[PDB]
């Protein structure tokens, strides 16, 4: 089955910085700092709808990864939808993780990121609360990784 | 005027490991990441309550700093407030903002980390959405790099 969940996360960071440092700029600087990333590298594409991409990263003292799949990109409307589809970084209870996300004008210069997840069960098993809160916390740990490099670094945004 | 927002984040990481870094070990996470923050000076006190803690830190294009007072401890019930009364990383429309926090454990076997903003407008003056908004920003912020830390480094929690 499908369990969607939305929300929103409000930022200072104007909109259009904020897109292109989360959907063009962020391979990069996931690699650059020191978070759980540890590698990501192209199996297909690069970049465009059909892209698929091996992201090596670190669990605590074990390392594991995840297939991703770009889903569509409109730009015009600063939407980016991607997935994430195999590996052993994908809990087994899982088949697909989508995202759906998409930038919009804030408050005070600043912008509203809205994002939709939509997690497929492997077999119509349930969601338990712990895969669907920890998949939560890597995102929003994600986002406020790109998010203060951004505000760190003026001179590139 | 007083206005008031709450919030509730799950995590994976255990109720006691989670409150300990973010009330103890904190101040030393700071330094060892990099972050905004620079520096942690006790300007009175040791950490219990009543102490007044100076931040600084580089705001990217800037320096700034704010000083911190701690309203309560109560390590039994995981619980600590603080609020910031000073310095000129404090918005001028602000004349106090508390913090009132607590961590509980979750039904399944994470913990919640509940947070309870309190903003002291300077007399009647409305509060602005930008203000409101970047002070979430920086809290969200600061709490998942605490969060990001435990989770890269199991050995010490
Ligand atoms: O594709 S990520 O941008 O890291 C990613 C981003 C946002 C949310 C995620 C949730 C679960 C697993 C991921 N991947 C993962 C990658 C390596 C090891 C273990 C899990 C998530
Ligand atoms: O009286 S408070 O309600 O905290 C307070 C409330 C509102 C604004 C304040 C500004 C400076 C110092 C305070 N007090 C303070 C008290 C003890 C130690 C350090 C500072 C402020
Ligand atoms: O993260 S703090 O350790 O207080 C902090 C430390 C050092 C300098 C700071 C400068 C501006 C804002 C902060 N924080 C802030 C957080 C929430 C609401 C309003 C301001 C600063
Ligand atoms: O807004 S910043 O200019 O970085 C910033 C400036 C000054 C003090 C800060 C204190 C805590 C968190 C921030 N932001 C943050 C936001 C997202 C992820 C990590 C940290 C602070
Ligand atoms: O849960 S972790 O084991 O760190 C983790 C492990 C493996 C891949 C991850 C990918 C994105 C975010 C995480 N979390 C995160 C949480 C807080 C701050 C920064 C990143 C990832």
Known sequence: GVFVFRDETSSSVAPAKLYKALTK??????????????????????????????????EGDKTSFVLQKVDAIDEANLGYDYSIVGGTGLPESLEKLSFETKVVAGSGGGSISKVTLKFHTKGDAPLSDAVRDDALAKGAGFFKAIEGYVLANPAEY
Chains 1, 2 share one sequence.
């Open 25 to 58: 700029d962020s391979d990069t600087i996931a690699q650059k700092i020191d978070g759980p990333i540890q590698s990501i590298e192209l199996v297909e594409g690069n970049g465009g709808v059909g892209t698929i991409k091996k992201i090596t990263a670190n």
